[PDB]
Amino acid sequence: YPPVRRDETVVDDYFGVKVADPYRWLEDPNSEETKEFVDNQEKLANSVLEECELIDKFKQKIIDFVNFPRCGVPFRRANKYFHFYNSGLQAQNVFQMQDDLDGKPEVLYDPNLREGGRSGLSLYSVSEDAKYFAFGIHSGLTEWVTIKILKTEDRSYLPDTLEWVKFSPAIWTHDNKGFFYCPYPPNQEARYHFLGTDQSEDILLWRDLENPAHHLKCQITDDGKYFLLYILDGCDDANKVYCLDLTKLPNGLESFAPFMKLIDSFDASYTAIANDGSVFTFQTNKDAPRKKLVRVDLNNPSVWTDLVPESKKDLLESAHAVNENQLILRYLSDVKHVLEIRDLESGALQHRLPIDIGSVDGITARRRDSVVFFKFTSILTPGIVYQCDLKNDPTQLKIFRESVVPDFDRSEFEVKQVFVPSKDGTKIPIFIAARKGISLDGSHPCEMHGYGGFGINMMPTFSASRIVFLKHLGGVFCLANIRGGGEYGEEWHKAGFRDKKQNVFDDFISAAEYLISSGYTKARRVAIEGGSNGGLLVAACINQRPDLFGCAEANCGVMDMLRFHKFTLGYLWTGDYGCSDKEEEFKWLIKYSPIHNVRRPWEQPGNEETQYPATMILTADHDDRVVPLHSFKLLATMQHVLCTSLEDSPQKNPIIARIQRKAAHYGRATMTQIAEVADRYGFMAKALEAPWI
């Protein structure tokens, strides 16, 4: 282990509790001492990884399994269709256009020609007349985007260059004169940009200097009549709704704004699904933690009526107006999708299609489209684009595109869903994937994934690397739908946040206990993996029950729960986590903060045989979302407490960081991501003493 300096003078008082921070100096990513740490850890990592002789076998198998063409879900503008394509191994997906769904594609924008495809497209917007394509380009490693506009007819750029954007969409008016977007000043704003003008001329529609942390999303209705502005605070599923009637402006957007403030609190979520003139259909969680559809007339805005009442059991995850007078509702029913077709006007059910284990997403059809397309994936189904022609054949899903994994016979494997009790009795759904016919004799290596926060739904989607694990390591994979997610509505989220964050960890630990008791695996043959809030999941669980796990892989985790709120966008997570500035919330946080709860398990009576799992801490060197000090401080703390603070420690399992050079949080070019995942699985196979098959 490399020498890592401790600054024994750094100590802080939290409400009478003294907390030492000997690796505070790792918070400065620019010092030579920090850069030397990174160099030293990289060297150590490389030295451990070169002992992991299956990395190259995993890598090539992952490459081979990923090497298949993928056509994304198409969407329509005017007569043209647009979609993403990848021939299999391109660094990023290429944006294509066609005149006909089965006609020859033209390339509209290829991210691979820029910076070797470090980053793909995240902002992509096509104008209503299909003549213009607005998209976001990253300049360097930062999160800042520049919006450029290309003409679809000849692929020439407009001069227009819009700076100081991050995650804004570009929302076009039906007159094709320009678009709404939400930039920051050189305090997010809502602006309108006219084509052929400099950004300095853009019309200001909204700012709130009195609430600088409030952030914005926007939308235009399918009829082109209303601009909707949504105002959000932090990460809560709740928002304001402001409506601007574009038909009543004396001189268009040039006239400048006078929003109708339909909803002006943060009490509930509201997404506009459809309107007929002033009569709006919303999706909302108001008095409905599993969501519902409601109707309100802007001309009588006090009076809301249920259109599709809240299900007693199932989350209404999304809703989409289609074929002029219908709705497709996407329900999540015990973490499996159910698609319903309903009448828009009455809300009446017409058809109901339960979906197999997997996930349907990517419905982009608009009210005026009669063909709806969507994507289905699952652990054992790489990717199908389905089409449903509501005009001519409403009852049938037809396969439009079907991905094929080379040399993968899905019939050798099986996926099941089971429900397991947490400490408090609560039923936790888990998916379990494995070779068919295995013996439940405790002998299989097992990988478990989870997240558990922020109302995020964890779906069992396709992963090529997971198939390598299953087939070539004889592995058992588990995806655990722990609390803190949104899978059973807002009550599931809140049963796993703030003072109840510990429930999330208990759920995950309860799942691992089930997999051991049921005979899939055994204590110390279980690997756990998670990212971001899921990286926190991994780090807390290994601190609390190191005896259960043989390998832990924490991707860009939030590890200093006392100081996270002080860096970049960490302040937006206090909704889920609390904040150590407030004593009560400090008292939740200090009990599970990963860098504050590293302890030698062998010093606990009865626990003399126990060490920490083999641990890989992963992070990009320029993650501006979750700053890498989290990872670095946890690494330093573990290495110290468990290894270099002792002459001949019992901690034999390696503790290392895989630090990606010249990487942001976003990017993930194919080969870069494959390299990372190959390293994570080779390490796991070595940690669990699992042979290649």
């Binding site: 990848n86 997906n93 990717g383 993930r668 995942v677």
Partner: peptide, 6 residues
């Protein structure tokens, strides 16, 4: 818009 299901 992930480039591949890795």
């Amino acid at each position: 818009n992930a480039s591949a299901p890795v």
